Design a protein around this nucleic acid. Structure first.
Ligand SMILES: [K+]
Ligand SMILES: [K+]
Ligand SMILES: [K+]
Ligand SMILES: [K+]
Ligand SMILES: [K+]
Ligand SMILES: [K+]
Ligand SMILES: [K+]
Ligand SMILES: [K+]
Ligand SMILES: [Mg+2]
Ligand SMILES: [Mg+2]
Ligand SMILES: [Mg+2]
Ligand SMILES: [Mg+2]
Ligand SMILES: [Mg+2]
Ligand SMILES: [Mg+2]
Ligand SMILES: [Mg+2]
Ligand SMILES: [Mg+2]
Ligand SMILES: [Mg+2]
Ligand SMILES: [Mg+2]
Ligand SMILES: [Mg+2]
Ligand SMILES: [Mg+2]
Ligand SMILES: [Mg+2]
Ligand SMILES: [Mg+2]
Ligand SMILES: [Mg+2]
Ligand SMILES: [Mg+2]
Ligand SMILES: [Mg+2]
Ligand SMILES: [Mg+2]
Ligand SMILES: [Mg+2]
Ligand SMILES: [Mg+2]
Ligand SMILES: [Mg+2]
Lengths: 260, 124, 181
RNA sequence: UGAUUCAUGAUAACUCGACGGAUCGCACGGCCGCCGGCGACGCAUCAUUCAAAUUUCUGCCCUAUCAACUUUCGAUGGUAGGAUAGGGGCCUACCAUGGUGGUGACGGGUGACGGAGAAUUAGGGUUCGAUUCCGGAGAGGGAGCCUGAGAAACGGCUACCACAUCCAAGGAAGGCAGCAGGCGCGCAAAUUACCCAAUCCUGACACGGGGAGGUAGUGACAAUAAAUAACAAUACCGGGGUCUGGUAAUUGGAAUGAGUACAAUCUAAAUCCCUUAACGAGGAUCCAUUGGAGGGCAAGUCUGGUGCCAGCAGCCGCGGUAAUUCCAGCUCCAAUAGCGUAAUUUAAGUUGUUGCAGUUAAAAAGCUCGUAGUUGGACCUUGGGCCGCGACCC
RNA sequence: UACCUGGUUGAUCCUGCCAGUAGUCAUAUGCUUGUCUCAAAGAUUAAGCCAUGCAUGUGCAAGUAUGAACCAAUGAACUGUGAAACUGCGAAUGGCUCAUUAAAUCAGUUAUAGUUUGUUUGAUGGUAUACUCGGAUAACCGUAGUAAUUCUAGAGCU
């Protein structure tokens, strides 16, 4: 190619979007923004496929051009805006607030949150280093730069950001024993506590996580997001509570529900 | 005979200021209930003051007859509908007029006028 | 690109390797006559379905009884075989799935069950009755005779409400005859 | 940071610096002229995102009747530069003589774009992979560029080669391997239709545009479901007088969709489907075909014709006067809205790794040595108990 | 379904191939063809040649109106709606094809501590007549040239 791609073929769209195969030749190509294209949930999908507010592309445009949707406290009119993990989606007309979390099957789920709980997001620190003028600055995986961060904050940390004031109100150090959520790979959406961190020089670092029921899983450092200090996450979790179920137990639940 | 109306998948879409639902029509002894008759019945059912705020579409009679399914929108007011509704549905409901144009003729005229510069473009 | 190109389709039957074997021809004709089939392909597709089910059951029998895939997929297969009336209650093992024959599948057709329910005088009369839209399963009329009837739907096979044999008005032949009279 | 003379600070200077807002909308209030909100557009830096470029390892068909290849003029490496967005013989100058190769280099062939995949498959495998997803490459063949963040762009330019268009002969204009359509080539492939309603992209943009894409048309590529009858009575044949079965262009009423069509529904508008008034079956002419009837291989040693002719025949064979095989009629058989005919898989344990052969069927080199390759004798912490399938102890 | 059958002999058992038997999201062709759903479709030969038409343009309250433009109002810079044109952005995506290309493309897996990146998101920005500078130019207007082309010259504005 002689430049950037503008189109996303529907077959080549992320599989967690759960787009259907015959809905068209194309999928919404996510715009550049805070989250990666392959790891985000675009606004058009949230509005039409998930919340059912809109029925068409044009209806999503109509809703967004009314300035009805705020992402993390700010009005977005781009339909392909890449909304991502832990983002607050608020509609200050119906009075509903949503935190974009992962279910245990790797798919973004709009989790309803309280009005007070929609006043902060959780960000993962990507790096800490000196900017111009020798001023220390923090950057996250959701594209934010924060200057003069707390010196106790290091890379891979989780900071609590107040959307109203745009400051770090609290932070969590990436340590063994902190409850985490996996945001990438086959364990996406799984919640557990870190048991040990296995480091290997020159290559990716492996984190060993054990969930509440005792199942153990391992994932790379880049796919781990701390959500609480200790065994108590700072945000509310979806109904699964991050506890992945085997297909046999899912069938048990379905059989019990049908029997009732 | 007795046409019974049943609204399912109902939601109040305040962003677009309308009610949207799946409309299930049960018409034993009838071929299918026309969209106008469904509009009047829905206006009676939902106490719609202006029945031009009701739009029903995508109707499908099942195999073996006797019942049909479609989708229905009821706008809170006529200005909401004229702003959010697609033009072809308004034309269906009589709220708009179909402008008869040929896309190919527009294309040819556009090319011919692109060959010209100035205010003389309109006279070409 | 055309989006319609992504719709899947597949074949439902195979032809025999030996076309002119007396024994196979006699057995196929016996089944076809017993169940009023329109051609050999209707029996061949039932054999194809039985072949796929049998292959699945055999593949889980060649795995450990604790293999979580055999517990899960064998349970699903047994549920599907009990759902369509192909297996009894005592037959609650994957071994009995391997013992199923095309007769068991042909016995669950809407044609066979309409004939055995007393609604039709013969298997062929059952076939025409279904194709004439006189038969409904539940509230849904079914004009497809290869319809596989579930056990929960067996007791709801009934004459259509729009059919002259199910409380509906007389057909065009009768009405024309009375108009002549 | 695994790792940096790293991030970053300070200092000395340097640069004829396209930087550091002479821009626009709405609202317009507070203090005595001054202050004042919400936005839009734009400049620069870092980070992020969208990506590219380059790059590590491993992996590709046939061919040795291709065994040497590369290095003047870059081949392999080194030093210093130049160039580039940046590493690098990428290029230059100098220097050294390297680099690859039977573990097949180099060369040749490919009716070779690669992959995801596809067909067939007990397992192993064989063959295919132009085509809708990912990657690459090209826009008649080469080459060179401008603009631009991004192009060595071709529905952009410049030139040459090859074709070729209009001309008033002075000039001028070109690139369907986009959509449709047309010549040609061929065994071989559709409409010069409608539309942005869906999907999505793009622009100053909620609005325009989109032969992307969708809708209809053609379409037995391929695939799915599924009619062409069912029942009863007489008569017959029966079988098990009675009971029960199969037969008749017999005789009867039932049933129904193919079709036609109000209408509604469908639809961007139409159309098809689904639904449905009225109509719509008796030789229900509302008429099923394609191949066969010696064997392989299901079905005739029936009838007429021909007479080693004509012809059939995948193979074995048939045909010379009694043709179960040709040409026909009748009957029967297979599949059936399908079936016949003209590369590849299976069959093939007839390529064999699983798994074939080599006394005489094809096949052990005349014999020995011998490098690479392939293959290589035995031997080294065992017991034991305890707690409790983990652990412990001796 | 992990399958064989005819054919060398007077007869036999073999080896062995020929032929048959099944499939092909495999092409063509022949005959036939009522209904429903689904759906490939000038790749193979010629990456051969193309008549004609279309396939890329684009405007918000928010860059620039004095159309000799339209509606509405009727001593005021600019009402509004605005064609045209300048400016900005896009046209490097998509679509098509498979000719070239055999460690090359490509696949999985790395790397940039070896770089560029309009845009999005976040943060950042201090030492260089001002109650706001200058000259042009398009649209417009009217003199043209040429057989001719979004071929083209000169004049007057802003
Ligand atoms: K590229
Ligand atoms: K370089
Ligand atoms: K060098
Ligand atoms: K540009
Ligand atoms: K559209
Ligand atoms: K748009
Ligand atoms: K551009
Ligand atoms: K790779
Ligand atoms: Mg430094
Ligand atoms: Mg150098
Ligand atoms: Mg080629
Ligand atoms: Mg390919
Ligand atoms: Mg080719
Ligand atoms: Mg093609
Ligand atoms: Mg491609
Ligand atoms: Mg190119
Ligand atoms: Mg060409
Ligand atoms: Mg070019
Ligand atoms: Mg072109
Ligand atoms: Mg192009
Ligand atoms: Mg017929
Ligand atoms: Mg026989
Ligand atoms: Mg004959
Ligand atoms: Mg052999
Ligand atoms: Mg011999
Ligand atoms: Mg020999
Ligand atoms: Mg040994
Ligand atoms: Mg085999
Ligand atoms: Mg492209």
């Amino acid at each position: 190619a002689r430049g950037l791609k503008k189109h996303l073929k529907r077959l080549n769209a992320p599989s967690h979007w759960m787009l259907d195969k015959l809905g068209g030749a194309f999928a919404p190509k996510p715009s550049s923004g805070p989250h990666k294209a392959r790891e985000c949930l675009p606004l058009i999908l949230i509005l039409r496929n998930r919340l059912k507010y809109a029925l068409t592309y044009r209806e999503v445009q109509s809703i967004l051009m009314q300035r009805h949707i705020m992402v993390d406290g700010k009005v977005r009119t781009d339909k392909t805006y890449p909304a991502g993990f832990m983002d607050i989606i608020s509609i200050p007309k119906t009075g509903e607030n949503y935190r974009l979390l992962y279910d245990t099957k790797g798919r973004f789920r709009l989790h309803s949150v309280r009005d007070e709980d929609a006043k902060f997001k959780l960000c993962k620190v990507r790096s800490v280093q000196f900017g111009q003028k020798g001023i220390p600055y923090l950057n996250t995986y959701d594209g934010r730069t924060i200057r003069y961060p707390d010196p106790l904050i290091k890379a891979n940390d989780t900071i609590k950001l107040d959307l109203e004031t745009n400051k770090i109100v609290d932070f969590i150090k990436f340590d063994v024993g902190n409850v985490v959520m996996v945001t990438g790979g086959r364990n996406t959406g799984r919640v557990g506590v870190i048991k040990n961190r296995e480091k290997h020089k020159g290559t990716f670092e492996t984190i060993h996580v054990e969930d509440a029921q005792g199942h153990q899983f391992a994932t790379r450092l880049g796919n781990v997001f701390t959500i609480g200090k200790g065994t108590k996450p700072w945000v509310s979790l979806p109904k699964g509570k991050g506890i992945k179920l085997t297909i046999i137990e899912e069938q048990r639940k379905r059989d019990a529900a049908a029997q009732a | 005979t007795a046409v019974t109306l049943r609204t399912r998948k109902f939601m109040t879409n305040r962003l677009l200021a309308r009610k949207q639902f799946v409309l299930e029509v049960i018409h034993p002894g009838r071929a299918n209930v026309s969209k106008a008759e469904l509009k009047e019945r829905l206006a009676k059912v939902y106490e719609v003051k202006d029945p031009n705020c009701i739009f029903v579409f995508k109707f499908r009679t099942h195999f073996g007859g006797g019942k049909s399914s479609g989708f229905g929108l009821i706008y809170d007011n006529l200005e909401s509908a004229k702003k959010f509704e697609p033009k072809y549905r308004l034309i269906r409901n009589g709220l708009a007029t179909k402008v008869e144009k040929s896309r190919k003729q527009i294309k040819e005229r556009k090319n011919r006028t692109k060959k010209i510069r100035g205010v003389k473009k309109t006279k070409a | 690109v055309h989006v319609n190109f992504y719709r899947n389709y597949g074949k439902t039957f195979k032809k025999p390797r030996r076309p002119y074997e007396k024994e196979r021809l006699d057995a196929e004709l016996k089944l076809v006559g017993e169940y009023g089939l329109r051609c050999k392909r209707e029996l061949w597709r039932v054999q194809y379905a039985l072949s796929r089910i049998r292959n699945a059951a055999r593949h889980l029998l060649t795995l450990d009884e604790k293999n979580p895939r055999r517990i899960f997929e064998g349970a699903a297969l047994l549920r599907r075989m009990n759902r369509y009336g192909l297996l009894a209650e005592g037959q609650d093992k994957l071994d009995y799935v391997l013992a199923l024959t095309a007769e068991n599948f042909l016995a669950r057709r809407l044609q066979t069950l309409v004939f055995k329910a007393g609604m039709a005088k013969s298997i062929h009369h059952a076939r025409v009755l279904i194709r004439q839209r006189h038969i409904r399963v539940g509230r849904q009329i079914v004009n497809v005779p290869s319809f596989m009837v579930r056990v929960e739907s067996e007791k709801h096979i009934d004459f259509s409400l729009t059919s002259p044999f199910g409380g509906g008005p007389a057909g065009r032949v009768k009405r024309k005859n009375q108009k002549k009279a």
